[PDB]
Amino acid sequence: KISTEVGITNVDLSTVDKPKTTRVTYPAKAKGTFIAFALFFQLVDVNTGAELTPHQTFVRLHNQKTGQEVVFVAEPDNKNVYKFELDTSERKIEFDSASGTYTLYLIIGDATLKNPILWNVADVVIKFPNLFTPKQEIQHLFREPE
């Protein structure tokens, strides 16, 4: 095999209105808060303009309050770009409940590629809607004497 690189352009994710758009670069996060959402990102090859498809292009959500995480996959059409549209009413089963603040990572990797990039594009806010432990100590409430 021969080594290859990875580059992200355009970006400019936008909050969906039942539609403003904002853009950011690769090094840093996005200022502000976006509540749903479809982040767009054009993955091109570095050093020579070309269109590649990394083997792994999952998009990750981490919840700080509970510690749970949820991962999705962005599948391309024939537009040379991806799309991750959040229905905010669909995928009720995947998100059992909504948390205020979600941290959005972009995990991307390949065997041929030389460096996998994973940084939080922006913070996301989503408002769509024991077995072996000491059990609670129970006492008995005696009847009051007459």
């Binding site: 999952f58 991962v71 599948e75 990797g109 994973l118 008995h140 005696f142």
Partner: protein
Amino acid sequence: ASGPRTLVLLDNLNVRETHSLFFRSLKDRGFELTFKTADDPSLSLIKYGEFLYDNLIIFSPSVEDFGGNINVETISAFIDGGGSVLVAASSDIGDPLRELGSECGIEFDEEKTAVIDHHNYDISDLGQHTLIVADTENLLKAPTIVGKSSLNPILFRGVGMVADPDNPLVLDILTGSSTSYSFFPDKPITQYPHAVGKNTLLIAGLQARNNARVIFSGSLDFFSDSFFNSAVQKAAPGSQRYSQTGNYELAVALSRWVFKEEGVLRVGPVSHHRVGETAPPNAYTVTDLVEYSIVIQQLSNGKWVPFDGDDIQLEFVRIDPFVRTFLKKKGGKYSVQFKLPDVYGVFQFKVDYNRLGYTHLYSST
């Protein structure tokens, strides 16, 4: 504990010489070892209802013909008869191995699969980013199962497995980092992969209701003397290079936990009586002082010393617990003195000790 005699099934006899360290330690503890090929038409682990092998070890990926009496139902009946079964598959699983896994609630994957990760892999991979370096951060963290010392980054190559969330008993030991997805290598991804998140367990364990320890590990090679002696350095630029892998200590801990050596408990004679008496009188009366006593032994090197018992809870239950108290450790016996409630009927003293990595003990009088 159990008996020392065990049976070892092999993919090929070469495993005797390449897994030398693990087998030598196992024999050093006294366990008698018999090696047989997984395709032998002569082996049998039961004869006239005897279970003539106490422990079973399966180091044979890529098998579909177990032998004379060994089937998936025979291994299931062996696990129902108190056996301790350790399996290890690596990218060559095979249909009966996957079926056996499905019989314990731990689903394997397709034959060609492998747990892949591109953030934490070591420089000794030389391939399609498949030699995973699982950190000791994401780990079950129970000193009975995994040991009581600090470890180093452990590394393995194999297939990923997921747990069925319907099982209350299944436990996950060494789940992979949030960068592993466990899909086909060298093939594009279309579906949703199998356990893409941090729920790619990679080393599972099952504790049956009759206290039968079963450890389904991926990565047969994880027990190979090549991984026991190789330094680890993640390919992320400039990661720390440890001298000792820290795989050997983990392996010995797992072996001592599945062959009933590190965590085992036993319930001795119980005794309950009126306060101020010596024998249990039939048909206690309402609001009568009652004393309860029970002994538990732990098998530390076979000594069966008294258990520590920080939090053991007695339940006085009719259909739902009327009383629930702690058992104060006093003179080797766990004795509590309490007054029976106003409600009459038949009742049940109940002790339940479900602790992670400890034998589940249950007693109701």
